[PDB]
């Protein structure tokens, strides 16, 4: 199976997933000086007012907080998007040290972690159909730097003990994702892919310029999770991020100058 180790890490994925060498792969390095300001880009519209979280799960690669996507409760619209995209889950990628962890980089700068809020285009009916379309998913990427604690993240940090190993899940209701958003919604956008297998090129990436800060104690907790399942040798879940891929024939656009 794929993973982030020396023998099953990112450099080996292409063997089982040839598209890993595709023309629209993520993540990428965002060069702030060659990104183009596009004044035709509308402001992002995030409506997480009626969001319904359901469960938190350790999937052996990261931990996901899942949401009820049976209706338009938590949606993303505007920006470079067409149509309504429903939030289905969010997860993180982090490092073993504070100087690495994000997947995207800005001018080669790596952050301590990166949060992905995954949404699917409602015109496709369900998530499974949406991942097969070029405009099927919209992922909001938010960088995390170490500094002051993020109040809204604590609820997530406290439940991690309960889902230490692969396959464990816990009830996680009434969690409000608005507490994880930075103050500004300025962003960069480019067409890309999922960053984990199957690595489908079905994503419109919306990466926020402004990072949120979390404390070292909060990030420390992430590093205590396990890739392994209960009863197997312990492998700490750290460095679950894919390196930047070549931009190729793509232009990164900015919603700000
Ligand atoms: Zn991700």
From Swiss-Prot:
It comes from the Eukaryota. It is found in: Cytoplasm; Cell membrane. The record marks 4, 59, 64 as: Fine-tunes the proton-transfer properties of H-64. The active site is at residue 61. The keyword Phosphoprotein applies. It is linked to Osteopetrosis, autosomal recessive 3: A rare genetic disease characterized by abnormally dense bone, due to defective resorption of immature bone. Osteopetrosis occurs in two forms: a severe autosomal recessive form occurring in utero, infancy, or childhood, and a benign autosomal dominant form occurring in adolescence or adulthood. Recessive osteopetrosis commonly manifests in early infancy with macrocephaly, feeding difficulties, evolving blindness and deafness, bone marrow failure, severe anemia, and hepatosplenomegaly. This is Carbonic anhydrase 2. It comes from Homo sapiens. The gene is CA2.
